[PDB]
Design an enzyme around this catalytic site. Structure first.
Site, short mmCIF file in Angstrom:
data_model
loop_
_atom_site.label_atom_id
_atom_site.label_comp_id
_atom_site.label_asym_id
_atom_site.label_seq_id
_atom_site.Cartn_x
_atom_site.Cartn_y
_atom_site.Cartn_z
CD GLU B 39 8.50 128.73 63.07
OE1 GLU B 39 8.51 127.53 62.79
OE2 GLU B 39 9.55 129.34 63.24
CE1 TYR B 76 9.75 129.06 68.28
CE2 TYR B 76 8.35 127.36 69.23
CZ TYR B 76 8.74 128.12 68.13
OH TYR B 76 8.20 127.99 66.86
CD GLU B 78 5.02 130.27 66.54
OE1 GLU B 78 6.04 129.61 66.39
OE2 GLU B 78 4.04 130.29 65.77
CG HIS B 134 3.20 127.08 64.15
ND1 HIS B 134 3.61 125.89 63.65
CD2 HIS B 134 4.39 127.74 64.51
CE1 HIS B 134 4.91 125.83 63.70
NE2 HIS B 134 5.37 126.95 64.22
CG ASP B 168 3.73 124.39 60.02
OD1 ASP B 168 4.84 124.75 60.45
OD2 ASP B 168 3.47 123.22 59.71
CG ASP B 212 2.54 124.95 55.80
OD1 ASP B 212 2.64 125.78 56.71
OD2 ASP B 212 3.46 124.17 55.46
CG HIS B 252 6.72 125.71 56.42
ND1 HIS B 252 5.84 124.75 56.55
CD2 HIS B 252 7.55 125.65 57.50
CE1 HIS B 252 6.10 124.14 57.67
NE2 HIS B 252 7.13 124.67 58.25
#
Ligand SMILES: *[C@@H]1O[C@H](CO)[C@@H](O[C@@H]2O[C@H](CO)[C@@H](O[C@@H]3O[C@H](CO[C@H]4O[C@H](CO)[C@@H](O)[C@H](O[C@@H]5O[C@H](CO)[C@@H](O)[C@H](O)[C@@H]5O)[C@@H]4O)[C@@H](O)[C@H](O[C@@H]4O[C@H](CO[C@H]5O[C@H](CO)[C@@H](O)[C@H](O)[C@@H]5O)[C@@H](O)[C@H](O)[C@@H]4O)[C@@H]3O)[C@H](O)[C@H]2NC(C)=O)[C@H](O)[C@H]1NC(C)=O
Ligand SMILES: Nc1ncnc2c1ncn2[C@@H]1O[C@H](COP(=O)(O)OP(=O)(O)OP(=O)(O)O)[C@@H](O)[C@H]1O
Ligand SMILES: [Ca+2]
Ligand SMILES: [Ca+2]
Lengths: 374, 260
Positions: B39, B76, B78, B134, B168, B212, B252
């Site tokens: 992230e 978005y 990351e 992720h 994650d 996770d 997290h």
């Protein structure tokens, strides 16, 4: 039969424009920054890269110590300038410098020595066959299809007024105004942060440049504009920040470029573009002057604003002696004018004669021996 | 070796500009020899750079990095970030999963996995890949199942059986129910040992979800993990933090494991 193709490079303080003689636009436009990795590591599909140049350097700038090698039109750091030239031929242009005649552009009043170190890198390090170096502003003018005019050329780090008569710049009537594009973007960030907007992150600050290029404009009469905005909403425009939150500016829009006419607004006790243009023309020989007012050409990125041409028209007319046919000429492609100029010249078979070859360089290269009009 | 996978929420400029939050991240990152930070929304690698400025401060090589490009299916975006101690391990090769076509990574994953080949000269496994994921919580069952074809691809590319997969995965609570574990090849096959169990709590929030996870395939790698070492590290309890403060760092917990 196709003739061996020359290259045109225009290395500006903010952007390098590069490409082939014959095209209507630089096949390459990237920023003039060089960055070295502040830390060791690697990008996932990649081998460790020692340095980045252009878009790549600005995309990853957070992990580099960036360098800007061209400070106000003049090459300041020749090592990083090799990285850029290097990048232009091998990565961007995809050519071997050894088989292409390169034409390079330079700033008005560039040091005789610098032009020479430039001639030397090309020949010694890039082993260019033949090469030319022209003054940026002359290329814009010739690009207007003309050889006499006065040029305002305003980029990212320098603005100059340059009278050229019959094809050559008139050296001591050249004025240099140390204010251009970057200063205006910073001034707009100034304005908007007073107003409670913040642009703190790199992405956020980056976009100011874009509202600059998008929504800023030049008021024909600053004073009246100022009244219009105080009483209406017609001048106001909004812009969505990269983060979805919106921005709305209204008078900001002509306030930022107004700095070009009134340097007061950034505390720059100096004269503005209209008057710098006037004062250059008055250093010229009184017969060519008629021609200068009529061939007052605009060039560069900061020359882009809507309205600017009409205010140069207006401001010079209220300053110019009552019978001069003032003509402000602003080309549609004017942010690329110098490069376009460079292309057009490099394309003419005629010009193959003025091109200095490495052979001439066996006989040294002095090139400049700088000159007159005062 | 001690390795973690930490999802640090909206890792970015702001976060890394705040000196108290940065101190904490630094204190957490330093426990590890290899940590995966997910992230990373950092348009210009400024926060990665600032983090590194912190870590490498008095030995320019305490940590080296591996980082992908912004990933996401045009939305978005990351980055995946691996930071390691180059004196403990080494990255021999890295690549980003795609299928046999360039748009294709994104047909099975929103943030297509980065996989890194490490040499470990301190542990019984001497060579192993880490694959990072992720997952996108609405696509979690499908992705964590597709993670098995990425294990296949690393074996065909690198002739490597020892594969640690971590990140994650959103592998619990409403994004993956008990019944859905039978749809996940990664879990179904005995090739894989799930080290963070379903009972774990790896969220800093009031949720109790084993989001996770760390998975290890290969009998040499499975032999290197120290038994009972895989756990979420609860930094809130560890540094006696308030709720607020702990969530300001992240929603997290790092999930770590020790290899020998
Ligand atoms: C960097 O990143 C960090 C984290 O992201 C940012 O820090 C947070 O920012 C906010 C807003 O700026 C801070 O809020 C101010 O601090 C107090 C709020 O907290 C109080 O709330 C309750 C009591 O009401 C209590 O939990 C707090 O005490 C602590 O609790 C923890 C957990 O149990 C313990 O471990 C600690 O040891 C503490 O005991 C704390 O009391 C407020 O002071 C302030 O509000 C103003 O208060 C004025 C004073 O009146 C009374 O207010 C309360 C209630 O009685 C009391 O605190 C005080 O003693 C007085 O009796 C009042 O006049 C004003 O009108 C106003 O109401 C703010 O809300 C927040 O605490 C920061 N920390 C954290 C961890 O989030 C940081 O800003 C980022 N940025 C930068 C640049 O660094
Ligand atoms: N439409 C626009 N309106 C205003 N500014 C613009 C526009 N288009 C480009 N710019 C600005 O023009 C500048 C870049 O122009 P240019 O390419 O002429 O400069 P340069 O050659 O890099 O540098 P210099 O010529 O000053 O050495 C930047 O400040 C850019 O933001
Ligand atoms: Ca220029
Ligand atoms: Ca929890």
């Amino acid at each position: 039969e196709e003739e061996t193709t020359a290259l045109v490079c225009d290395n500006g303080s903010g952007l390098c424009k590069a490409g082939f003689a014959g095209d209507d636009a630089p096949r390459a436009v990237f920023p003039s920054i060089v960055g070295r990795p502040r830390h060791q590591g690697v990008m996932v599909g990649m081998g460790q890269k020692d340095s980045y140049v252009g878009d790549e350097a600005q995309s990853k700038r957070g992990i580099l110590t960036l360098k800007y090698p061209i400070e106000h039109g003049i090459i300041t750091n020749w090592d990083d300038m090799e990285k850029i030239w290097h990048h232009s031929f091998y990565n961007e242009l995809r050519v071997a410098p050894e088989e292409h005649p390169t034409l390079l552009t330079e700033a008005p009043l560039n040091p005789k020595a610098n032009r020479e170190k430039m001639t030397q890198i090309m020949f010694e390090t890039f082993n260019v066959p033949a090469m030319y170096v022209a003054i940026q502003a002359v290329l814009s003018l010739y690009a207007s299809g003309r050889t006499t005019g006065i040029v305002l050329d305003s980029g990212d780090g320098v603005t100059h007024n340059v009278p050229i008569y019959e094809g050559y710049a008139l050296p001591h009537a050249i004025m240099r105004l140390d204010l251009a594009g970057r200063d205006l973007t910073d001034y707009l960030m100034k304005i908007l942060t007073e107003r409670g907007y913040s642009f703190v992150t790199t992405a956020e600050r980056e976009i100011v440049r874009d509202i600059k290029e998008k929504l800023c404009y030049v008021a024909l009469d600053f004073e009246n504009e100022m009244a219009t905005a105080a009483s209406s909403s017609s001048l106001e425009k909004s812009y969505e920040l990269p983060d979805g939150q919106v921005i709305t500016i209204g008078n900001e829009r002509f306030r930022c470029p107004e700095t070009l006419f009134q340097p007061s607004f950034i505390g720059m006790e100096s004269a503005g573009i209209h008057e710098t243009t006037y004062n250059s023309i008055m250093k010229c020989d009184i017969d060519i002057r008629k021609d200068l007012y009529a061939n007052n050409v605009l060039s560069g990125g900061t020359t882009m604003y809507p309205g600017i041409a009409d205010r140069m028209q207006k401001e010079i007319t209220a300053l110019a002696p009552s019978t001069m046919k003032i003509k402000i000429i602003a080309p549609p492609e004017r942010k690329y004018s110098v490069w376009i100029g460079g292309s057009i010249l490099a394309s003419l078979s005629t010009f193959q004669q003025m091109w200095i070859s490495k052979q001439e360089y066996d006989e040294a290269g002095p090139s400049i021996v700088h000159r007159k009009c005062f | 070796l001690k390795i973690a996978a930490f999802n640090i929420r909206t890792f970015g400029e702001t976060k890394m500009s705040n000196a108290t939050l940065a101190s904490y991240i630094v204190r957490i990152v330093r426990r590890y020899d290899i940590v995966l930070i997910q992230e990373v929304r950092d348009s210009h690698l400024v926060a990665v750079g600032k983090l590194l400025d912190y870590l490498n401060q008095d030995d320019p090589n305490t940590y080296h990095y591996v980082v992908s490009e912004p990933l996401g299916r045009n939305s978005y975006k990351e980055r995946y970030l691996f930071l390691f101690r180059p004196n403990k391990v080494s990255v021999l090769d890295t690549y980003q999963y795609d299928d046999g076509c360039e748009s294709c990574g994104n047909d099975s994953f929103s943030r297509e996995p980065a996989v890194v080949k490490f040499s470990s000269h301190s542990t019984k496994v001497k060579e192993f890949a880490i694959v990072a994921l992720h997952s996108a919580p609405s696509d979690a069952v499908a992705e964590i199942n597709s993670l098995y074809d990425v294990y296949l691809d690393v074996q065909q590319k690198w002739h490597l059986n020892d594969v640690m997969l971590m990140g994650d995965f959103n592998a619990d609570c409403s994004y993956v129910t008990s019944s859905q574990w039978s749809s996940i090849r990664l879990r179904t096959s005995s090739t894989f040992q799930w080290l963070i169990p379903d009972s774990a709590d790896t969220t800093a929030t009031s949720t109790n979800c084993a989001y996770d996870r760390i998975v290890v395939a290969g009998s040499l790698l499975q032999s290197s993990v120290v038994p009972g070492s895989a756990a979420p590290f609860d930094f809130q309890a560890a540094y006696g933090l308030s709720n607020e403060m702990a969530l300001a760092i992240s929603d997290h917990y790092p999930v770590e494991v020790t290899l020998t």
